[PDB]
Design a protein around this ligand. Structure first.
Ligand SMILES: CCCCCCCCCCCC[N+](C)(C)[O-]
Ligand SMILES: CCCCCCCCCCCC[N+](C)(C)[O-]
Ligand SMILES: CCCCCCCCCCCC[N+](C)(C)[O-]
Ligand SMILES: CCCCCCCCCCCC[N+](C)(C)[O-]
Ligand SMILES: CCCCCCCCCCCC[N+](C)(C)[O-]
Lengths: 86, 183, 183, 183, 183, 86
């Protein structure tokens, strides 16, 4: 059922790319702040969380318009397929 | 001597030589190994050789086969890609089979790719076939269309003689005598 | 001597040699080991050799089998792929059985691949078969079509004599005498 | 001496030699160990040897069995793959049994693979069988078809005499005298 | 001496020797240990030996049993695989029992594998059995078929005399005298 | 009776088979990343999540087909066992 196959595969691909960007940013920031604590040999729990929050908020301010474009496109498309037979 | 072409493959060079010889142009093929083949002609023949290279659009591009668009090794494939690889293989197998029939020199086959739509929830359309073939001189072409139609009809689940097109041609005159060298 | 072709395999070389000898062209085969075989001819015969190499499109391509598109040594295999490899093995095993009949030299077989639809939720189409074969001289072809049809009919769960196409041909004249050497 | 073939195995070499001796061509087999066997002939016979090699399409391809398409080392096996290996092993065990009957030299057997549908939803369909065999000279073939049919009928749950095809042939004349050496 | 075969197993070699001696060809078996056995013959007999190796397709392939396809090394095996191993062990045990009856030299037995559609929800189907056997010379075969049928009928939960096929044959003439050495 | 026992057993068997591969790859990725973070001392903790999300989604793409064939065959089987009595 090429229609069910398409809609089902695209749902998962969209989950993977919508979620990837915030987690990539968070991971890279995490690594750099973890390193800096080693070369400084200076340690605390809170600095990485503090920076990660800002990094993710900026990520959302920037990309969020595109999240809307992608979701609207998919939303229309699935309805048209569901009611396509008539 | 003037250089016409460089860095050719074996099977490009042989085609170029064949076409120049047919029009009375003596040409020479040279091998440079990692650099490929080079082709040379005399000055009196240079103009003509350039005119023919333009007119025939030499050297030829390689053969195109649909499976080249849908490699077997991508991470994932939709059904459409698999179905296209399948027909892209059946075409080549029928061509290789027809080349064994009596007195056929070469052939080409084309199949209607229904794959460009799903036909889901829908009646899938019947198949259509086209073939081209070249014969040795003195072959009764009219009597030989029947064989090919009969053979192709049963190669697929639903084909009508009406849906099979066949085009035949005889071989050209043989090029046996060598071209003359400029005085 | 002029070089026609280099880096050929054994089967390609012996094919080219056979075709040239048939037309009275004396050719020579040279072995370079890891660099393959080379074919050479005399200058008086160079022109003709080139023309025939073009006309037959030598050297021959490797033989195509459907299972090559759906390799079994892969991480996962869709039902379409498995359903394809099964048929592409039955075809080959029938060819190899036909070659054992009395007086047959070679054959080709083709089956209708109903896998080009899943036929899920659908009734499966009937099977169609096509076969080509080459016989020794003095064989009663007319009386030999019956045996083949009878044998093929029971190879599959549902086949009608009307859905089986069979094409037969005789071996050409034998090339026993050697070609003449240029003066 | 001219080289025809290199890197053969033992079965390929013996099949080549057999077919050449039949046409009065004296051939020589040489062993290079890790490089396999080589075949050589005299010059007066080179042309003929080339023509017959082409016509019989030697050296033979290895023998094909369906189980080769479904290696048991796969990460997953479906029911379709399991039933494929089951039938692929029953066919071989029947061929090996027929070779033991009185006066048979060799045989081939084919079974209708219904596994190309999952045997799901639709009820299964009755089995069909085909056999080929070769007999010693002076055998009443007509009277011997009955035994084979009788033996095959009870080897499966549901088979009708109407659904069993049997084709028999006699061994050719023996090649006992050695070929003559070229002058 | 000319080499026919190398790297044979002991049970391949003794079969080849037996078939050559039957046709009056004196052969020699040589042991190279880790390299196996080698077979050699004289030149006057070389041609004949080749033709017989072709006709009997020697050396013999190893003997096939269905348990080889379901190695029981699995992590877990389906009902389908377990039921196959079971039946394949019963077949071997019955062939070994029949070889103990009076004057039987060898036998083969086959059973209808109901496993083809085991475990699809449908009930099982009645069993069928086939047997072949070889007798010493001067045995009243007609009177001996009854015993075999009687013995087989009660080995399974539901079997009808109608569903048991039995084929018997007598041993060939004894090969006691040695072949003559070439002059 | 035995049909009941058989069907109930098979249910657990199918759960095991289908779920097994994703949980294997999520284990192997967890071990490898945890070791790597001791081989070079970095105290990040989202990196496992970031990698194993891609790891699990990839094999869901690969096995998407066999998943549907197994469940269809099972459903047909149990519907037969339930209704076909005589
Ligand atoms: C995003 C997670 C949930 C996605 C669920 C998608 C369901 C697809 C159902 C069909 C799967 C089998 N298939 C592809 C052969 O149709
Ligand atoms: C920590 C907040 C998590 C919110 C998750 C959803 C993020 C995408 C949608 C909100 C986008 C808001 N924005 C950037 C348009 O202002
Ligand atoms: C504090 C987290 C709030 C998350 C939800 C915010 C509202 C949804 C985003 C609305 C705007 C969408 N956009 C950017 C495409 O216009
Ligand atoms: C967080 C994801 C949970 C997914 C659980 C369901 C797995 C099966 C998804 C349907 C089959 C695979 N596919 C790619 C078509 O989605
Ligand atoms: C959560 C179990 C795994 C996901 C698959 C669930 C079954 C979805 C329906 C399968 C349909 C198969 N198909 C497309 C061939 O019909």
């Amino acid at each position: 059922m090429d229609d069910l196959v398409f809609a089902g595969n695209k749902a998962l691909y969209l989950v993977l790319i919508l979620s990837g960007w915030p987690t990539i940013v968070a991971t890279i920031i995490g690594l750099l702040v973890g390193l800096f604590q080693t070369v400084t040999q200076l340690q605390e729990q809170t600095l990485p969380f503090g920076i990660k929050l800002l990094g993710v908020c900026l990520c959302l301010f920037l990309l969020s318009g595109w999240y809307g474009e992608v979701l609207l496109s998919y939303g229309r498309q699935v309805i048209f397929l569901a009611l396509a037979k008539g | 001597d003037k250089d016409l072409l460089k860095g050719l493959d074996q099977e490009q060079a042989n085609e170029v030589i064949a076409v120049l010889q047919m029009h009375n142009i003596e040409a020479n093929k040279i091998d440079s190994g990692k650099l490929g083949y080079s082709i040379t002609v005399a000055e009196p023949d240079f103009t003509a050789a350039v005119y023919w290279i333009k007119t025939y659009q030499l050297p030829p591009r390689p053969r195109v086969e649909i499976a080249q668009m849908f490699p077997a090794d991508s991470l994932v494939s939709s059904p459409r890609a698999e179905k296209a690889r399948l027909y892209s293989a059946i075409e080549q197998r029928l061509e290789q089979s027809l080349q064994t029939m009596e007195g056929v020199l070469s052939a080409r086959v084309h199949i209607s790719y229904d794959i460009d739509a799903g036909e889901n929830g829908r009646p899938p359309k019947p198949v259509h076939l086209s073939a081209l073939a070249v014969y040795e001189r003195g072959s009764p072409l009219a009597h030989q269309i029947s064989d090919i139609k009969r053979f192709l009809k049963n190669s697929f689940a639903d084909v009508d003689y009406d849906n099979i097109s066949v085009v035949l041609s005889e071989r050209s005159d043989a090029q046996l005598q060598a071209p003359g060298t400029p005085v």
